[PDB]
């Protein structure tokens, strides 16, 4: 068989390839930014007062 079976055309094939590459780039950038932010927060919070920062509020505010 052949000549077309749930297939696409080259003009649309290249467009789909470019769209997929762009989406993958955006997703990778977002994931890297999120990971960098998480690492920064972990480095800044691991110094001290890990649970006290929330305990003070749980004691002040309504539990």
């Amino acid at each position: 068989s052949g000549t077309g079976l749930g297939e696409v055309d080259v003009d649309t094939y290249l467009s789909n390839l470019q769209t997929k590459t762009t989406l993958s780039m955006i997703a990778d950038g977002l994931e890297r930014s999120a990971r960098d932010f998480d690492a920064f927060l972990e480095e800044n919070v691991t110094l001290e007062w890990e649970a006290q920062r929330k305990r003070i509020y749980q004691h002040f505010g309504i539990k």
């Binding site: 068989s1 052949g2 000549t3 077309g4 079976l5 297939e7 696409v8 080259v10 094939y13 290249l14 390839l17 470019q18 590459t21 762009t22 993958s24 780039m25 955006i26 990778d28 950038g29 977002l30 890297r32 930014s33 960098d36 932010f37 920064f40 927060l41 919070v45 007062w49 920062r53 929330k54 003070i56 509020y57 749980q58 002040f60 505010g61 309504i62 539990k63």
Partner: protein, 1541 residues
Amino acid sequence: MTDLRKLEALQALHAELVAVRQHRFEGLQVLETLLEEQTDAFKALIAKPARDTKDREALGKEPKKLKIGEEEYSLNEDFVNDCLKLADELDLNEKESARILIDCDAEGDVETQSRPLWECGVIRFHQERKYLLDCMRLILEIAADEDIDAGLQESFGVAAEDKIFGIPPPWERQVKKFIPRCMEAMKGVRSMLQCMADKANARNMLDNQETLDFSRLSLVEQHECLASILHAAVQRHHATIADFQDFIKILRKWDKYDHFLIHLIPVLAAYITEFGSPEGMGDLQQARRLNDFICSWALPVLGAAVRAWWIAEHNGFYLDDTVQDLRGINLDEEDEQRTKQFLDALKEGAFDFILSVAADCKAQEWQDPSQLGARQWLQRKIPSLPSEPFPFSHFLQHSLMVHLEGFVDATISNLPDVLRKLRTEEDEQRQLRPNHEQDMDLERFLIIISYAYEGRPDAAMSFWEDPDSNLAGFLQWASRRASTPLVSAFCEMLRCLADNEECATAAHNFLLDEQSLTWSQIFKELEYFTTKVCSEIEPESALMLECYLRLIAKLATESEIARKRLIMDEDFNLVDTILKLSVGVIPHRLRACIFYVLKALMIRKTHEELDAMWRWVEAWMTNPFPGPQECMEMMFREFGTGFEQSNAFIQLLTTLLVPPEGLNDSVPFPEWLGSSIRTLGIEPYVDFVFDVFANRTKDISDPSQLRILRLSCLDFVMVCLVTFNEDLIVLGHESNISIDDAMAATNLATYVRLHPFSRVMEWLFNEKVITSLINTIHQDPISLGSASPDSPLVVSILRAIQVMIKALELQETYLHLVRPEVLRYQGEAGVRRKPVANAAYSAFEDGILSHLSLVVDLGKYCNLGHAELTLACLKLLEKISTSSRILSAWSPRNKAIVQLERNGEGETISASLSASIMATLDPALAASGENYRVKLAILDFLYACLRATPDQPTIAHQLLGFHCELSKLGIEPKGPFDMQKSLFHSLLNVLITLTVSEEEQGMRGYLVTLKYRVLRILQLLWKSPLSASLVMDELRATNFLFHMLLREVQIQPQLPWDGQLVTGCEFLLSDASLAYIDYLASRAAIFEYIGKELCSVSQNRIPSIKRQIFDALNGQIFPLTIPSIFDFFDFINTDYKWEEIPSPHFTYLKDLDLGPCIGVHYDIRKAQEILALKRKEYEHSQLATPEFLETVELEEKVLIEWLTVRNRANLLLTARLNLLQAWANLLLVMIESNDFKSTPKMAFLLQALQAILPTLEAFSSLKSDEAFELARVAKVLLWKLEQFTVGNLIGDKLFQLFQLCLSAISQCSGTPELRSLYYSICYRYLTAVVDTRSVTNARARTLKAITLYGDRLLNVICDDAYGSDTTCQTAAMILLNALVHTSRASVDCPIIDALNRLNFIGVLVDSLKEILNEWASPSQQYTSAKLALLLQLCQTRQGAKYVLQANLFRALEQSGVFVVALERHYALLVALARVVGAAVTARGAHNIVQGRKFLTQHRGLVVHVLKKNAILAQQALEERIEELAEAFMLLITATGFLEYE
């Protein structure tokens, strides 16, 4: 081949002999090698072994296995029957018949002819002898050629002496002579022909008639060849008296008169010339005995002619008494005896028989109507030929004419007194009894002389060189007072003795006075007859007048002094006499002769001659002795009766329309033609011609006359149409009245009003004309098949097709710039014209769209072989298919598809087209090869038919072998296209078997054009979705791309194009640019097809062809190797500098720009007119106009080239671009659709990177068209990513590529798309490669490279951000984040300071307002990246100061921002809270006040988030809520709100 059979060997030998005969000695060694293999064949002329009974019994007993020489074959019940039938038909031995039939079966001629095997065997047996004798004939002919080298002339002679005559050469040496063998062969041929005729008459008294006719033709040709061989042998003095007596006896026993006697007469003529005349064995003792023996006969005229010839040739001895002995012999007695014998021979009809033979020899199927009834007014009593198709050759006619002129010379130089006494006796007889008609001996003899001296000026000059010789003496003596027949014969002789101009001038000077005949008496008799007719006429007077007219016409056509003298002679007044004679009551023959005389006189003329001719015509047509309007039409109707006078008048008109300058202004006729009388000028003539051609074509019974009349009418129409200026009228209507003055407008108006083109078109718009045309073109195929290439039918059809083409071309010009002007002129002035056009037929296609058999006839006429006719039919069909109204009427079901499917016309048309395109071409005659021209015409027709209306099927789909159905196609079972035998498969075959790589020249031009046209047709068929699936299926099932790649050729700057190098400056001006563009387009199409097929095969998940494709691409075939795709990337080279061009100085014409010249196409005429106007103004200024003129001229000669160069260059550029694009696309299809491992292909990736590195370095900022194509593939392959070296190379290449991207970004080159590609390339490099001494070194080097550019690049990055484009802004926003991250990775940072100095932070924070309006979607990701970048800055200690000075607290308040939609909202809130917390906690206790204010103004909202935290979408929402709570808690604990309470 080399192992050729008898038939093929003889055919090759005949071809080589014919080639050598045409001055081509490229086969001398081939002939020397062939003549040695067929020695046994040339030994015996023809000999068939007698039918043996032993072989018959052996074949009939065990017809199982046969052994012939060294080969063995198996016999079956059918082959044995065929052998027996052949042996019984030809009485041939069983072994020879079996061998012939085995040869026929091996060669496979049964399918080529589709005939029984025995008929093919008989045909081969006849062809054997045919070629075996034709070879000997050509050999003996070349052996006597005087226009060749003496060495070869003697070599062929000795070869013929050794092989044919079996006489060994002088350097060496029971057997039988050659004459008896030839005589026995001819006798056997005669007996075989007689037996064949008897058996055919018995059996007939079928499908074999044509075979019998061809066999008879071959037999008569073999007999003629044997006769010529015998004549040559006799001329070589290899005869005796025994053979002479035998031949004389055979002649005496002749029964019937046929072509055999006409073929044998040269034999006896040469015999008598050798033995009779003193030009050989001049033995007087034997001569007397031969005379007594010759002087029983079954036909007395033969004996009379033989005796007359013998006497004429024997008189050479009784001339003098010094060269021989004549003692003891009487003279007067023998003289009287010979005289009485010659008189008896004459009375018996010798000259009559000679004349009848001479006439029947040159019997032509068609004759020129200018010589009707000439030399056909005698009393012939000899029985005529049976009219069977036995045409003669050329050598036989030459020999016959030579013998006749020799006999004439002998009779004139030996028997003058005989002719004198004969003439005196005839005169006395005519005088003593005028009522009776004496014999025509002298007239017949003069006519025979005329026939002999025809087309032979070398011999005709003999009658003029020596005016005191025997020939000139008799010529001058035969011009004295005589009767009408003798004068007519002398005039006909003079006419036929004017084959050239010198002989015509000699005859003119000899006829005029310097008694004999003179022009004075001729004109006196003409005037006498004119006065007698005008105040009956006998046939003799009419014949004399016709002869005089023919002679005058011939002299005027051949000579020039006579044409210039008689035309303006005051004492003769030839024109006046012929005009007074024509207006009288006389047959049409005299009028036709007068018209032909006028044509001859007007074949070359000047302005004064034309003026005088028109004056005389008007004077004699206005009052021919009733108003002029009536007399003119009466004379027209009188001259229209018949065909001879009508055709002659049409030819005269056609000749008069030719200008004196030859084949633009000064229409070839006086502008004041008919100004005196109220007439339209020349229109009446064309009107009469057209109405005669339309209505009076039914009264012509003779088909030849009808064809000639139609051809004359078509030639007249073509001469009238070709004399019309098209571009002139266009330029006039464009700029004459709109720009130029109104002075010349009158000239163009008069030209358009007086030129008959308008009336010709008006008549062409009539139904009678197109009906007559389609009837003439509609003829049976047998006529065209049996006709000759120069037949009048083919010429008439060609002229009709040309007229149709010209009409289809000029119909628009007529309807636009002719019809309205003529209508306005008729409305303004007073003109009375009769319309002859159909208003309903708005165009020329309306009147012909109702004929469906036209296309059928045009297609059937393609199997004739005529190059011109085939090209004309193809062009006509192309123009028809290109029209719109015809295809709208056909397909408004359809009428064309059903018309070609009546009796299988489409199948035979496709078969003929396939056989034609498969025919090889002549390498030497590339541009002149008719086969190549037909191929190109067919390809252009197919291209034009497929390009127009591709969605709906057309005739091209049917011709290709498809079942044209309504809005659907298909293939039929067992059809031509299903069995891989059709036009499409033929094109595929001829393409895959085409090699362009040559050595002598290399990269030919016309093969490139052929393959380019084929690929264009293939692309048109592919792009059409209605004919795409089946085409791809048929292509992939035969490995088309594999054959194409095998036929590919690498391109390099060393290989020249047609012997010309590319670097040469003339390359841009030469034609090699066309071939280069065609090759580029071919490569582009091949790459596109390969990519499409690869994508299809990959998306179908079948490894059957995937691995094959990859193997073919890598360079291996399962092994044959081929260059990989990377090898074909050699067309990208900037060394040629196609973009750069050296601009000359151009000291003048510099201000002349190309504004109005300009799809880059600079017209040359737009600048030509400007420079012409400037030169005219410069000349009018009168300031050194003559000197500097030359300067300007050469300047033009430069700029023209310049213009063309640019055009060419432009083309090349775009061509390259196209190819590149295709290549790029292909490469993409090679990267994505590739499941093979990555580590093995890494070498190919590095090779591609190395190849593109210089391409990008050369086009980094030059052009923004190829940069996108070369950067998108780089971006793609960058995401698809011993080992130490590979990693180092990859890193080095990436670092090198990272430089040009930043360079182009800082230079702000290309469009936002190319900049986005560069941004992505740099982002994937600064994010993955850099992210450990090597790492630190790479980071420092990248930071240094970035600082090298500095703020110059950040400025552009910020400018292109938050702009018009949607993707470029996001790409720049992400690249900024990547850059700041990589910089912080290396407590301060220069990137943040640079961004702050450029006022970017300010606008970035200001844009934060109205974020809710902006917030998968592009705007969402853009805002996300923006907030991420803003948050990244709040982490550094230095950035806190700037983020605080930006005053974002008041900006985030104006926006009023404070399961998937909720998730996105919470993500935005988390981003904002993170930004705020980072900005507050970065600096320290200086921002806590703003944090407290924000927490107090937005209290409560954060409480809900902090209390909420205290399937996939749910988990994502919970994670976002947790992140928001953590961010708010961090902000609180950093601000210190607890202390505030």
